[PDB]
Amino acid sequence: GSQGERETWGKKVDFLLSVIGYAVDLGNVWRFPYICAQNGGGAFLLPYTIMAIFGGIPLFYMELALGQYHRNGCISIWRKICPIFKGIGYAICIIAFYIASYYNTIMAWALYYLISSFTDQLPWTSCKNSWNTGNCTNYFSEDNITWTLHSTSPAEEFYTRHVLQIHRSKGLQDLGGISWQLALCIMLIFTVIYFSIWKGVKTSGKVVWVTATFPYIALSVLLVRGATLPGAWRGVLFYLKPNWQKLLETGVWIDAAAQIFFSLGPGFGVLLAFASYNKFNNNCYQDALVTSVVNCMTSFVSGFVIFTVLGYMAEMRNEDVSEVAKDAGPSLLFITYAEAIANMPASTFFAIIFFLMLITLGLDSSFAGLEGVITAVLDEFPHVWAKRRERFVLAVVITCFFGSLVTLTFGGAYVVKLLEEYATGPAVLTVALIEAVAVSWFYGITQFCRDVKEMLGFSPGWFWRICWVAISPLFLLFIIASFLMSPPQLRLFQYNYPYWSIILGYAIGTSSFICIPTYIAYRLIITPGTFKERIIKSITPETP
Amino acid sequence: DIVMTQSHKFMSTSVGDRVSITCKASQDVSTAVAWYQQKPGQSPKLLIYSASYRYTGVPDRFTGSGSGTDFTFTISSVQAEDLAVYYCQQHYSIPRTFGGGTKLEIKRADAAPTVSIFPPSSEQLTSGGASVVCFLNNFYPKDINVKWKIDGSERQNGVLNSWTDQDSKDSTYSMSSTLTLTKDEYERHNSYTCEATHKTSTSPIVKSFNRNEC
Amino acid sequence: EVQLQQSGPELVKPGASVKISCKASGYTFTDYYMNWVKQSHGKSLEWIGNINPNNGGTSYNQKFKGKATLTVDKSSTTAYMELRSLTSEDSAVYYCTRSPVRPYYFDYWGQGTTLTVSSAKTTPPSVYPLAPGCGDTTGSSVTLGCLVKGYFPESVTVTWNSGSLSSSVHTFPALLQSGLYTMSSSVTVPSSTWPSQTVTCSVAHPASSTTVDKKLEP
Ligand SMILES: CC(C)CCC[C@@H](C)[C@H]1CC[C@H]2[C@@H]3CC=C4C[C@@H](O)CC[C@]4(C)[C@H]3CC[C@]12C
Ligand SMILES: CN[C@H]1CC[C@@H](c2ccc(Cl)c(Cl)c2)c2ccccc21
Ligand SMILES: *[C@@H]1O[C@H](CO)[C@@H](O)[C@H](O)[C@H]1NC(C)=O
Ligand SMILES: *[C@@H]1O[C@H](CO)[C@@H](O)[C@H](O)[C@H]1NC(C)=O
Ligand SMILES: [Cl-]
Ligand code: NA
Ligand code: NA
Predict the structure, then answer these.
(1) Closest listed residue to residue B54, CA positions, set C107, A149, C35
(2) Is C170 annotated as a binding-site member?
(3) Which phi and psi angles does C215 have, rounded to 5°?
(4) Ligand 1 centroid to A505 CA: how many Å?
(5) What is the spatial distance between Cα B37 and Cα B15, in angstroms, rounded to a whole number?
(6) What's the C106 CA to ligand 4 centre distance in angstroms?
């Protein structure tokens, strides 16, 4: 009665592009070209696929299958599998809030850059502005110029002193106050995601049509543009030059594993929610396969889109694209690439489509990012929730805005690094390992192959059973152990993070998954009788 | 890394001729080549940067050309003070490497080597040694034979020939032939004689002196 | 103007360490990268590494990783380079040179530092005058000279009358034998100033800090 069965998706292509749109984001565009260039060049293509075939694809497919089979949220699905691990469904929620605290602000920057890209003369071309210093030296000026340790470029000046305004803060210690411009930008973004989420999967399935197809068009325009630029072969050479001695280093394998894990994004509850709304007899294998393989291919061509332009930039300057692509962060897009676009014909066009591309790269992923949590909460508190969806979605968008006010400060970029590298990563990897173990070693892999055999009509191959049993948990275990054994020393804009930053990162990191052990203790302490009977009634799913 | 290869380790030219030094790089460089000049006994001095551009305080006679991997440093009017070792260096990729170096030697007309023999001084006889010295000044080219004669017999032991670098004023080499001997042997012979064979004349220049208080 | 003054020559025993200074003047010291180039005897230039004076931002070469350590002092605008585990290959002339960030050229260099890594004892030079004989024919010009025998290392300076005049002085490169160097110098002066006036050759040895002056007597 009343609700009973849940709703279903409006078309196969909508869900196929929704998952693709969530999988593809900023990092696919710029993190993969950098990590591919600095870790063996073209030879990075070899371990990147292995970590996919053995690690990424099995988690992606197993998550999309569990989601499309059980049709439950990230929280209520554990009550029907392993109640003690229900805290997982909560942990991810908290995790999402941290991601949403910064991932949108980044887009805000692009948005503030987009609304600043409608002028006939781009603001970051000249030095006669209200934010430039006396060190600002630009081009279209007297030739012979020689760069100095204190000299700066109008683009670097525009990012540093105008939009980001990071010169007004001394670090994590002093970062206040808040920039109202980026607050309004992130409000507009939280509004464009509000009207794209508030109705449920209908609008995020109609809006995804645009958010997921535009980046390929923009990447195509930038691609055929950058291929025509003189001296673009240098960036391609630096992008594909095989350096097989890097493969001897045990670091590049960990870099590839981590990169393909985030980029694929299993273990976050997004694929669970997206798979939940679908036909029971609908095929899941082909969907997961195609989407992931596209997500990789798209990264691969994005590499060219970036390195052709950076090759042209190295030609205009003096070569060694590694020198011009030293900084691995937002500065590679907001300063370097932007300065390269400004010196091209129809600069307004390629700027509008570039920043618009960035925003459209971000939107689909935060759409999903919220979609998983919303689905989880609505499925965990039914009839206490779902009274309206707009109320909860609004409470989340607003919560993310107040959670992003720390990032909208002048030293907000500092917090972005802190949140992006020390907090979300190791916790998502941790909960992904816990989930992979619970589904593989608690619920039983044989019964899982039986559920896929019921849904798809055939039992999964031995390659996948042997992947879920041993290969995938060791795949996540390797990354977690590698990170925990040596957290990277953070540095951003000639500013090294204090030594206690990692403690703050761990505090944010630890505060996310306090619920899984405290919930195991909660259910283990609430259910009467012996601990063996409590863990037996707590590990085995509900019989009816 | 980058290997800047200068094939010609030595190049000969004359005062007023057009001389060009080549520099071969490993990979493509675009226009990131600098040319430095190091005079014998001085620190390197930057002359060219970014293939063709000249640095401040550099004469107009030094030029630069090339775009890719092979680059050329050209001197139009070679002067006597242009005698130095020239180095090329890439300035794009880390690390910055240099070339082998091309010592530009100046070719001119022949010059007669002024030979001057010198008897061991009294301060050295006081210390207990005696070295007859034979100087060869202002000649060209470098190839020149030096023969020693204690008392008519060709002396060969204890002779050290020291060739200096070319001159930066008149481009003339100079060398020193040293005959180091003991005091006891010096006071048992009287007239020493050193002769030099050069290409300016067929007859070797012969210098002689007497030990009996000159 | 822009001057980079390095330290003097250094004679050090193998296995020890040596630090070379680099006092900069004539430009904004916090504006340019400070570099160190190694030049071996008869070899080419060899970039060791640079350092950012604002924070000491060093950037070494893979070939010198763990071999050289670059430091900088902003209070006196002076750079330093320390070399440990010294061997025979390290006995060379080291320069410190200024350089911008882009284009990365070496606009101004230091005078250099002659480093000798050997266990040979610092031997004082024996200065013996090389005066023309009293039986020679005094023509339009007489050729004088002084002799330096037995010293280590290659750190010697032979001047003539406080550098006046020296428009015809020929200095011959030192020759190493049995662990000791030996060199000579000459000077062609006209016959209207000798032996009337005073012509005295000065021989300085910075390694042993011994300056012996000898006057020429026919
Ligand atoms: C979210 C909560 C639970 C985390 C709290 C953990 C505490 C112990 C961590 C988090 C942030 C950390 C602080 C971050 C800022 C500073 C300022 C610095 O000048 C001294 C270290 C100090 C004072 C750190 C001490 C340890 C610290 C206070
Ligand atoms: C999950 N793969 C992408 C998707 C978008 C983005 C992301 C992931 C999860 C969430 Cl909940 C959100 Cl809002 C956004 C992200 C962040 C860090 C690393 C990878 C990724
Ligand atoms: C240029 O930058 C330096 C530090 O990078 C600063 O000290 C200096 O004041 C700046 N110049 C001007 C004119 O502001
Ligand atoms: C280029 O810049 C320098 C300033 O360091 C200047 O002195 C020089 O004259 C300029 N021009 C050339 C051709 O080097
Ligand atoms: Cl990827
Ligand atoms: Na991705
Ligand atoms: Na996206």
Answers:
(1) C107
(2) yes
(3) -95, 140
(4) 10
(5) 18
(6) 13
Which residues are in the CB-under-5-Å shell of ion ligand 6?
Answer: A 23, 28, 263
Q: Which residues of C touch A149 (CB under 8 A)?
A: 30-33, 52-54, 101
For an interface test with A, give the residue of B2, B93, B97 to mutate (most A CBs within 10 A): B93
The CA distance from C9 to C205, in Å, is 11
| Amino acid residing at A262 | F
Sequence-distant contacts of A405-408: CB under 8 A, at least 24 apart: A405/A178, A405/A183, A406/A101, A406/A175, A407/A101, A407/A102, A407/A105, A408/A105, A408/A108, A408/A178, A408/A179, A408/A182, A408/A183, A408/A186
Q: Is A231 on the interface with B (CB under 8 A)?
A: yes
User: Which of A144, A315, A318 lies closest to B91 in CB terms?
Assistant: A318
Q: Looking at the partner chain, which of A144, A315, A323 has a beta carbon nearest the beta carbon of B30?
A: A315
Task: Tell whether ligand 2 has an atom less than 6 A from the beta carbon of residue A401.
Answer: no
User: Helix, strand, or coil here: A316?
Assistant: helix
Residue by residue, DSSP assigns B27-42 as: S--TT-EEEEEE-TTS
**For C185, which residue in chain B has the nearest alpha carbon?**
B176
| Helix (H/G/I), strand (E/B), else coil: B88 | strand
Structure tokens at A539: 């590990």
Across the A:B interface, residue pairs with CB atoms under 8 Å apart total: 24
* Rg of the Cα atoms in chain B: 23
**Which residues lie across from C118 on neighbouring strands?**
none
Which chains sit next to C, with 3 or more Cβ pairs under 8 A?
A: A, B
* Contact in structure between C107 and C33 (CB atoms under 8 Å): no
Query: Who contacts B28 (Cβ-Cβ below 8 Å, separation ≥6)?
Result: A234, A319, B68, B69
Residues of chain C with CATH 2.60.40.10: 120-215
Q: Whose CA is nearest to atom 15 of ligand 2?
A: A262
Per-residue tokens: A178: 């808040």
**d(C-alpha A50, C-alpha A46), whole Å:** 7
∠ CA C90-C94-C100, rounded to 5°: 135
This PDB structure is determined at a resolution in Å of 3.5
User: Any idea of the CA torsion for A357, A363, A369, A372, to the nearest 10 degrees?
Assistant: -130
> CB atoms < 10 A from the CB of B208, how many?
12
Nearest alpha-carbon partner for C147 in C129, C169, C173: C129
- Ligand index nearest the alpha carbon of residue A299: 5
In this complex, is the C-beta atom of B94 within 8 Å of any C-beta atom belonging to chain A? Answer: yes
Q: Are the beta carbons of B118 and C131 separated by less than 8 Å?
A: yes
Counting atoms of ligand 1 from 1, which one is nearest the CA of A508?
1
Q: How many domains does chain A have?
A: 1
Technique that determined the structure: X-ray
Distance from residue C99's CA to the centre of ligand 4 (Å): 13
Determine the residue among B43, B132, B168 to mutate to test chain C binding: the one whose Cβ has the most chain C Cβ atoms within 10 Å: B43
Tokens of A213: 């197809």
Measured CA to CA, the distance from residue C97 to residue C106 in angstroms comes to 6
| Selection from A15, A383, A389 nearest residue A204 by Cα | A15
Burial class (CB in 10 A: 0-12, 13-18, 19+), A458: exposed
Q: Residue A212 sits in which domain range?
A: 1-544
CA dihedral A370, A372, A378, A381 (to 10 degrees): -110
A255 touches A39 (CB < 8 A): yes
Q: Which of B44, B45, B209 sits opposite C133 (nearest CB)?
A: B209
**Superfamily of domain C120-215 in the CATH hierarchy:** Immunoglobulins (2.60.40.10)
Indicate the helix (H) or strand (E) that contains B195.
strand B192-197
Write the DSSP string, A31-47: HHHHHHHTTTGGGGHHH
Q: Which domains does chain B have, with CATH numbers?
A: 1-108 (2.60.40.10), 109-211 (2.60.40.10)
| Contact across the interface for A318 and B28, Cβ inside 8 Å | no
